[PDB]
Ligand binder design. Structure first.
Ligand code: ZN
Ligand code: ZN
Length: 126
């Protein structure tokens, strides 16, 4: 029965860890998006409907060490504007709130999709 109690408990933790997990990753992806939006300098060719995926590379202390296009929007100036915006954020020390294994698994190399309209939505400070 002890094996059985364990499953039950394991199923249980896997439920909560995933609801908590999703709130965390949601909150951190939101932070990335907002910080990149604040840095973004929109190019004349940007349009609603575009999407660029960028691979963001970080250290556990939150320093960003690289950003590159993982899937192009089809418009090279928008693509480049997203990569520059990422690099310009500089650091996300908020990452230090993660246990290291979670960092390493999810945020050391992370692909985020950026859209001009969402970057414009969040481009203000305060
Ligand atoms: Zn505005
Ligand atoms: Zn502005």
């Amino acid at each position: 029965a002890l094996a059985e109690l364990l499953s039950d408990t394991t199923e249980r933790q896997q439920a909560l860890a995933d609801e908590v997990g999703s709130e965390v990753t949601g909150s951190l992806d939101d932070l990335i998006v907002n910080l990149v939006s604040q840095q973004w300098r929109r190019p004349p060719s940007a349009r609603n409907g575009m999407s660029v995926e960028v691979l963001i590379e970080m250290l556990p202390d939150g320093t960003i060490t690289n950003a590159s296009v993982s899937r192009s929007s089809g418009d090279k100036p928008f693509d480049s504007s997203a990569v520059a915006a990422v690099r310009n954020v500089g650091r996300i020390p908020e990452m230090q709130q993660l246990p290291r294994a979670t960092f390493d698994s999810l945020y050391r190399q992370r692909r985020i999709i950026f859209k001009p309209e969402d970057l414009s939505l969040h481009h203000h400070h305060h």
